[PDB]
Amino acid sequence: VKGDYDLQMAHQTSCSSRQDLVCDHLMKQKASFELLQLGYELELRKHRD
Amino acid sequence: IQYRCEQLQEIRRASQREVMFSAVDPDLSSSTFLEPEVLRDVREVCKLRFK
């Protein structure tokens, strides 16, 4: 059991790390989109003036 | 009206074919090549938001 647990823990840790990487990428992507979104919002106000 | 036109003309001029984006060969650490200001500001804005 110990052996198995060890094996599982090792697997999990590996998976967690992989997940973190995926999350990081998606957040970077979101950050970029939100910057652009804000850009459009800002642009419409100047057209109203 | 003239004041507004001058402002938009300045933006058009600034837009004209500008911002050399050197492909940062990742391996080439050393060449101090200076990141265009626009790239640095955008990156920083994006990084700040990411964090």
Side-chain angles (χ1 to χ4, degrees):
Chain A
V1 175
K2 185 179 178 181
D4 186 70
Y5 286 178
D6 290 341
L7 186 65
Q8 285 187 34
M9 287 190 69
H11 190 252
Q12 291 174 345
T13 305
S14 181
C15 281
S16 183
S17 179
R18 291 179 190 167
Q19 286 181 325
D20 288 338
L21 283 167
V22 173
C23 270
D24 286 354
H25 192 75
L26 288 173
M27 288 177 137
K28 285 179 185 174
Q29 190 179 43
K30 189 176 189 305
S32 296
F33 287 164
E34 288 187 349
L35 182 63
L36 259 138
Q37 199 173 0
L38 187 61
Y40 277 115
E41 276 195 5
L42 287 169
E43 187 176 332
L44 199 84
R45 193 177 285 186
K46 286 183 182 177
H47 292 340
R48 288 180 178 162
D49 289 343
Chain B
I1 295 172
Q2 280 185 354
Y3 177 76
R4 287 208 175 153
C5 285
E6 284 178 3
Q7 285 187 353
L8 289 173
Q9 196 105 6
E10 203 130 8
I11 297 173
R12 188 176 225 185
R13 275 189 226 147
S15 69
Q16 253 80 92
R17 310 102 222 284
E18 289 146 78
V19 200
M20 27 282 329
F21 297 97
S22 64
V24 183
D25 216 340
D27 269 341
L28 260 113
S29 127
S30 43
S31 89
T32 9
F33 284 95
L34 277 152
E35 190 177 19
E37 205 178 356
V38 174
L39 295 174
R40 185 186 40 197
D41 291 345
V42 173
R43 182 186 50 221
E44 274 182 359
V45 175
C46 288
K47 293 179 179 179
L48 201 85
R49 185 63 177 179
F50 166 76
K51 287 183 182 178

